[PDB]
Amino acid sequence: SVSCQGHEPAIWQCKHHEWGKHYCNHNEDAGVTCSDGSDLELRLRGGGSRCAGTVEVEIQRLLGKVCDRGWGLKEADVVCRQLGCGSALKTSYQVYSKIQATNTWLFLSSCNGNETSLWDCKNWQWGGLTCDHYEEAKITCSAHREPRLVGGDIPCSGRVEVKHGDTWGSICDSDFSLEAASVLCRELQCGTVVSILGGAHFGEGNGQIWAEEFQCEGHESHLSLCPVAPRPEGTCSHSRDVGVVCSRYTEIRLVNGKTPCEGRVELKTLGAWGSLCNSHWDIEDAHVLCQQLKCGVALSTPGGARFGKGNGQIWRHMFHCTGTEQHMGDCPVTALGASLCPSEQVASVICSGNQSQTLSSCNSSSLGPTACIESGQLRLVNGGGRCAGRVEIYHEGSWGTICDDSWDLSDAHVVCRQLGCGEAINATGSAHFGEGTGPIWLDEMKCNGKESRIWQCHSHGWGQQNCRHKEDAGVICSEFMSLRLTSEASREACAGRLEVFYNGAWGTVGKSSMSETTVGVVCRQLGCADKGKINPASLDKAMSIPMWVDNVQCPKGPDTLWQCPSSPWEKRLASPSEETWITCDNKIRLQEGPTSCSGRVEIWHGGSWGTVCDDSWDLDDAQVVCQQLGCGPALKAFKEAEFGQGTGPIWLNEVKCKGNESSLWDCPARRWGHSECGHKEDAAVNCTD
Amino acid sequence: GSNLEMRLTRGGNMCSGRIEIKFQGRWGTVCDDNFNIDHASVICRQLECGSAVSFSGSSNFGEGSGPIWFDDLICNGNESALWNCKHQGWGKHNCDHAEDAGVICSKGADLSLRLVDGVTECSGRLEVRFQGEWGTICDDGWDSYDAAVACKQLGCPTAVTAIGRVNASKGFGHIWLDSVSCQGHEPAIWQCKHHEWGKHYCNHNEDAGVTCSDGSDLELRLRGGGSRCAGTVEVEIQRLLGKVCDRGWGLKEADVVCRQLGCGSALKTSYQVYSKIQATNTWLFLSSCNGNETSLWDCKNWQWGGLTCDHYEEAKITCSAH
Amino acid sequence: SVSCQGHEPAIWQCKHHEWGKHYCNHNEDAGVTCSDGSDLELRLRGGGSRCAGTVEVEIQRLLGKVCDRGWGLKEADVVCRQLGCGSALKTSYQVYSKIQATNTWLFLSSCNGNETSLWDCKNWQWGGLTCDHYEEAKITCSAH
Ligand SMILES: *[C@@H]1O[C@H](CO)[C@@H](O)[C@H](O)[C@H]1NC(C)=O
Ligand SMILES: *[C@@H]1O[C@H](CO)[C@@H](O)[C@H](O)[C@H]1NC(C)=O
Ligand SMILES: *[C@@H]1O[C@H](CO)[C@@H](O)[C@H](O)[C@H]1NC(C)=O
Ligand SMILES: *[C@@H]1O[C@H](CO)[C@@H](O)[C@H](O)[C@H]1NC(C)=O
Ligand SMILES: *[C@@H]1O[C@H](CO)[C@@H](O)[C@H](O)[C@H]1NC(C)=O
Ligand SMILES: [Ca+2]
Ligand SMILES: [Ca+2]
Ligand SMILES: [Ca+2]
Ligand SMILES: [Ca+2]
Ligand SMILES: [Ca+2]
Ligand SMILES: [Ca+2]
Ligand SMILES: [Ca+2]
Ligand SMILES: [Ca+2]
């Protein structure tokens, strides 16, 4: 029990007990290890790289390990920081080799987590103790498998590349999957995954092609936390590089501001820098912009042009933000047919700059006629758009519906105007948009139509109702749009006239300024295919409906037509030579074959191409595939990847076609799921020319 | 040059371990990249130990990087020494991780094949001892030719060799071998061409297996019908009963069964149910028959167990002599 | 490893392992709770009546809950009978309101089912551990 302050000349000068009498045992004997600090080294061994494995220490040319008695993520962070491998993620790893056994151990008391090196942690013991009920300490830092995207114009699209040590290599499209894509867009903070594009869509890489597959479940926050399955080498070439498109494609910056936190809002689309205008720009949108830019919360949005107006370009996008979103790419945005706005009106925002503030809801709903988000939240569910669906309200930490009784247009007007959806066209009841789950918060609502919020209406009370779930209220608002392709044969098809449903009315789209990006967006939005072409006008036109919108220009990144800039809405009677007719490409494809009717079966669904597993594959199934492409009767139904390996996910599994189905979609099978089938089992067919 | 000497370290044996070369009086550990099976053969031939069965990257540590005298070498595999072939660098290297390239020569390697989880000795799963760990074999690429080599090596009757495991539920461990390609005359399984050790495209569910048998242990009969010429197909091999799954069941293969039973040609694939039949777990899978074979045992690549068919059902047949 | 029969005059008198420094890798520190039998109270909250909800235990004015390690209809029968609400039917309840959060927990070994009160079951532990893979104990008695 020697007690030394740290400046005594010798040990016996210190406080201690009587010489010769102690309760100690010879097992607990004291020693020291004095060092220049030259000989101390740290390593990770057995994990697949230098940033994963078992922590190995070598102090004065003696090898040891660290006992995990008090090992946590705070202590692991210091080691990963010391090695330069980023922050620690988990206290385990996936083994790749075997590491030799040593007898010596290193013991740690505790670390604050901000130390630069492990040797700076207080009271670490080298040897003198054995730990047998515990194991060694293992880490997996965040630089184990660092991903990146390259080769894309928009911020969150490009070629997938992962760093192995200090080199970057490409990935073949047979190894990537939809679950691994979710962990890659999420890790890079790019939101959800929109599409997977193989075959060197963004160009080819040079230097390395990693031969491994990530077995990701889909919820991991890093690619390092995901198991990796080694695969045979040389199975792919650089023409098979994989690429991804995530959902955060928006570019917003603040310019002409004295400080970086405040300035004039600017947006980049179609390759030009322009400024938004003040209409439909609110504090909720400004809160999200400041949070994304990491400035904090927005004090106010100056009117007029406080920071001036630069450049001739004006962008008329409208963002409908709740205020809780972290990125402007999460906010619903519509730019189709947006009205012109004067050059004087330009959006601005002045953020606090503290970066420490975090905002949340304040006070309560306060039912009754009359830096925090509103307590009551409104949303529309299951309507096919943001401006149609079943009305729901957030109260006491739950989402609840509104009773059909005494629900009319006057009650609907305040619902549509509060959400930024314009006026109300319909007020539907009796579960038109489906049955709801949860409490019925309101009943017998009576509104004059001039109110601001729904809780300002006269109602019986919060949760006081005699209703059932089959009578749930819904609205259809004025600013609600749907899209379809109309032909003579069918109202909805993959070829026909393009019609836009706006203000409760249908109408056509002008053909001028149509591009391949614009035609592709329509085909992907409707679910037909990935690309398309505009054919001349057909022989018959139905009802000669008036033209709604024109000059539609679609950038790269949107998957719906509502986000494409255009000219303002204008209902005009127009000749059939101006209306747009579009034919989409085939949803099924045969690839890697000597003849067009023989090859590997691919189907397009959910934004990306995919293959079909060969279990339950027969000739009757092959009959449908040859029928859909227009080929002749099938010769044989190949199995086990005869023609090659497939790209993308695996959509259809356990296919049982009756033999007379028009398309593979009508056949009963496991549809749009995550089966166990691998790409080695994709099916192929051969058809007569 | 002849001044260089190559030694193997950290493997526990002379013939297996990490490659070390002495240049200018210092040891060096060659980096793994550009390591072809030709160089593994040459290195095992330089030491005169034998052929090379594995070329593992071993501990690939950037820390403590040592200069490499023979890096990014290219060779045809016919030369007796590494320096004989064309060289890229001398004394240095441009390598990303991949340190301590190690080889495992055949003579120093200890490899064995055993059968386990079977009704008899010559039946069940196949396991391979690779460096002391027992590992399974992936069934992808398993045919009757690969079974014949395995039966000879295991010392079993080779009159009739059938793929598949009769009752082994699953295997635990590594999958050492995948896509074994034997011509049927090789002495051992590993002597044939296959994927690199450890690399596999499959799970532990599809483990390989053989059923070596001379004959008279497998009998075919029809049950549950009006007579012996109509009813469900029931097969019993080594006194283990089973039924045939109808994944590829047609009038061509059913004709072989009826002809084998002496019941004439095949009329229908169903029958009238007179009595019930007890259920059996194990299923017999056959790919396809030409209708010329005298018995089912003459059809190629018939697999006895190892897969399940939940969506399909048992095979049935009604012959003409009903 | 203190082993006593309940009649010894002190802890060191009854058979214990030895006097020495112990690591106790798997176990924790020992403690007791001595009571006259009046401070302990049991009640059910959040269920829409006194006979349904989440079992809330208050001992010496400390509010806590009961872990469901050994919770079953046989153990819940003691609680319903002790409260006087009949017999236990279901180990759940229909929610009517929200309940407070308490750090303390109660752990039960087993109850024969015929005990008059929960304070008569053998070897019940008041605090000292935590429940991470388990939840609170909820019952619905018959007289609900
Ligand atoms: C780490 O944090 C502790 C606790 O706040 C503080 O005393 C110490 O100075 C910090 N060290 C460094 C290097 O910032
Ligand atoms: C909405 O109201 C319009 C105008 O009366 C009517 O034609 C249409 O059928 C209504 N739709 C629904 C879904 O109620
Ligand atoms: C399969 O059954 C046989 C007897 O028919 C038995 O010896 C063997 O152990 C069984 N296998 C398994 C994996 O249970
Ligand atoms: C059956 O036909 C095949 C294919 O022509 C032929 O090779 C074989 O010899 C025939 N078998 C008999 C028993 O005639
Ligand atoms: C409860 O039942 C058990 C088991 O039969 C019995 O030993 C015990 O004495 C009973 N308790 C009372 C208080 O009757
Ligand atoms: Ca807004
Ligand atoms: Ca009603
Ligand atoms: Ca009303
Ligand atoms: Ca009512
Ligand atoms: Ca089928
Ligand atoms: Ca297989
Ligand atoms: Ca083979
Ligand atoms: Ca005791």
Residue numbers in the entry:
A (entry chain B): 332 to 701, 712 to 1030
B (entry chain C): 154 to 475
C (entry chain A): 332 to 475
From the study:
Circulating haptoglobin acts as a primary defense by binding to free hemoglobin, forming a haptoglobin–hemoglobin (HpHb) complex that is then recognized and cleared by the CD163 scavenger receptor on macrophages. CD163 belongs to the scavenger receptor cysteine rich (SRCR) family and is a type I membrane protein with a short cytoplasmic tail, a single transmembrane helix, and a large ectodomain consisting of nine class B SRCR domains. Here we report the cryo-electron microscopy structures of human CD163 in its unliganded state and in its complex with HpHb. These structures reveal that CD163 functions as a trimer, forming a composite binding site at its center for one protomer of the dimeric HpHb, resulting in a 3:1 binding stoichiometry. Widespread electrostatic interactions mediated by calcium ions are pivotal in both pre-ligand and ligand-bound receptor assemblies.
Given that the CD163 trimer was the most prominent species with the most distinguishable features in the dataset, we performed 3D refinement on the trimer, which resulted in a cryo-EM map at a resolution of 3.0 Å. The structural model built from this data shows that each individual subunit of the CD163 trimer adopts a ladle-like shape with a dimension of 80 Å × 65 Å × 175 Å. The first four SRCR domains (D1–D4) extend away from the membrane, forming a handle, while the last five SRCR domains (D5–D9) near the membrane surface create a compact, bowl-like structure (S2A). However, the disposition of the subunits in the trimer, designated as CD163-I, CD163-II, and CD163-III, is not symmetrical; instead, they intertwine into a structure resembling a tilted cylinder. The trimer is held together by four direct interdomain contacts involving domains D3, D7 and D9. Chains CD163-I and -II pair through D3–D3 and D7–D9 interactions, CD163-II and -III interact through D3–D9 contacts and finally, CD163-III and -I contact each other through D7–D9. All contacts involve electrostatic pairing interactions coordinated by a total of eight Ca+2 ions, which are clearly visible in the electron density maps. As elaborated further below, this configuration is not compatible with the CD163-HpHb complex formation or ligand binding and therefore represents an autoinhibitory state. Comparative analysis of the CD163 trimers in the unliganded and Hp(1–1)Hb-bound structures clearly demonstrates that in the absence of ligand, the upper ligand binding arms of CD163 swing into the vacant ligand space, engaging in autoinhibitory interactions, thus creating both direct and steric obstruction of the ligand binding site. However, upon addition of EDTA, the average mass dropped to 140 kDa, corresponding to a CD163 monomer.
